[PDB]
Structure 1
């Protein structure tokens, strides 16, 4: 049982290169508009306390070089929505998929299409951490790479990449340009809030381990939801809600293991550890598979 990303082709067809001065990053080209991080308009000096409204009014359309492959797209208009720049271009992208912009909740997962110079380079699954960071793989030039889910033929864009933190984790916005978390697009070392573990996802992954034939961690003990949550909070796990328990119904039915029985197994793991044993190859409790993620793979 492994992380599976959505097929990325519908997003690849939207990626372009956006350049301003000596800064180059990626843009997302949908219909006749290119979306990208606004910090592309900052110089080395600006980046420490950039007054974006002032920096933007001093820009003209021809300051923005947009390239789709070896084709320049002429910028005929520009505006800013929160931390994203929207460049109107003279050419519509015929590869534009059916799409929407969604703001994801902490604990939800999405696929990242990492891009450099407008060229897609890798795809992988991420979760929105409870502290609103993501543990991405992003290098210099990755900004403007997007995260997404696919439902039927519709692409739900939920993330655009802006920055790395001192700890090596990453932060960004939705496609309306609002950051996830308390972060700011200035060139400063920024710490996140204390992260917690996504409990409903650990439970989904334990169920996956069961479906795969792994059951050493199960027990006959039981727990109430409240008592489980007391232990969870003690170990910096997120609360489990009744909606989470409901969400885990299908996996419970399939394995014949009551949700609260799986909670008791997890409680024992938190308290006793894994004793060197492993679950699905991991020495650690994995929390970036959602219940939906497990089902889609069974």
Structure 2
């Protein structure tokens, strides 16, 4: 029984609001007395192309921003910009504010996204930050400002805010301090994500999950070196494995008795020869959106 799960979204649902600047409406995150959203909400048709946000923001007054939490309107009483995030100070602290922190994640790490439209939560999904710094998300228009998060022991770690849809059906965004993930800019310009790769450490975690779940047909008697594994992996668009990644997998090795470079030889064989009509955890394809931590928690 191994299904991918998102975190329960209730604590985040209590924070979603609707932000409108002129004709543009998108989602905001209401924490204490501040609403956070993408700074491009201030952009206009002319602005779109090569905007100067800061010139545009200081020339915008608080009444330009319409914030709605359900049917109750929040009055913006101050506004400031931090990198690509707009911070709107409101006259009311959110009584539903959970315990939270803003964290920055790394490519390969997983989190849940609460997809919203016009400030209303629509759905939740679990994903990983791709190695090319994009997120395979949904194509729910009007979702800019939807956030990504993890929950650790009652505390919500917000790690991502959605800013734009790339042409290839992938999304790009920032952390909650407005720093972009990846080499992207918040402007309507020709932008494309680099070629994506498979998150090797997560595939290995998933193979560890399969062994713990008694799906062991792919285990072999061989081991490989990290250099030999990396040469093969990069030819198949698998991310290179670092010593840090090997260390992260340490506890799964101790739990299963399969050394990391032993499991690497299994994965190496799987790349070069495939599954030959067999499945792992019931899937014919290798999963790379489960981290080693996700496996230890679930298993």
Distance 1:230 1:180 in 2: 27
What corresponds to 1:228 in structure 2?
A: 229
Distance 1:116 1:285 in 2: 32
Distance 1:15 1:170 in 2: 19
Distance 2:139 2:211 in 1: 33
Q: Secondary structure at the match of 2:269?
A: helix
Deviations 1:107-129 (A, max 9, x none): 10011111111111111111111
Shift of 1:243: 2.2
Shift of 1:277: 2.4
Using a 3 Å threshold, how does the CA distance of structure 1 residues 45 and 283 change in structure 2: closer, same or farther? farther
Shift of 1:57: 2.5
Deviations 1:62-115 (A, max 9, x none): 110001110000000001111110000010111111111111011100111111
Deviations 1:42-67 (A, max 9, x none): 12232122121122133111110001
Root-mean-square deviation (CA, aligned residues, Å) is 1.2
Unaligned runs of 5+ in 2: none
TM-score (norm: length of structure 1): 0.97
Deviations 1:9-51 (A, max 9, x none): 1111111000111111010011100000011111223212212
Question: Does the 8 A contact of 1:27 with 1:118 survive in 2?
Answer: yes
Question: Does the 8 A contact of 2:139 with 2:169 survive in 1?
Answer: no
Q: Tell me the matched-pair count.
A: 298
Shift of 1:281: 3.1
Q: Secondary structure at the match of 2:78?
A: strand
Shift of 1:245: 1.6
Shift of 1:145: 0.5
What corresponds to 1:275 in structure 2?
A: 276
Question: Does the 8 A contact of 1:26 with 1:144 survive in 2?
Answer: yes
Distance 1:241 1:49 in 2: 39
Deviations 1:137-158 (A, max 9, x none): 1421101100011111211110
Moved more, 285-294 or 214-223: 214-223
Distance 2:140 2:125 in 1: 14
Question: Does the 8 A contact of 1:114 with 1:138 survive in 2?
Answer: no
Moved more, 217-226 or 143-152: 217-226
Q: After the TM superposition, which segments of 4 or more aligned residues of structure 1 sit over 6 Å from their partners?
A: none
Q: How does 1:198-217 map to 2 (within 5 A)?
A: 198-217=199-218
Unaligned runs of 5+ in 1: none
What corresponds to 2:255 in structure 1?
A: 254
Moved more, 260-269 or 55-64: 55-64
Distance 2:32 2:257 in 1: 48
Question: Does the 8 A contact of 1:165 with 1:189 survive in 2?
Answer: no
Shift of 1:213: 2.0
Shift of 1:234: 2.3
Moved more, 165-174 or 274-283: 274-283
Question: Does the 8 A contact of 1:166 with 1:189 survive in 2?
Answer: no
Distance 1:169 1:280 in 2: 27
Distance 1:276 1:59 in 2: 61
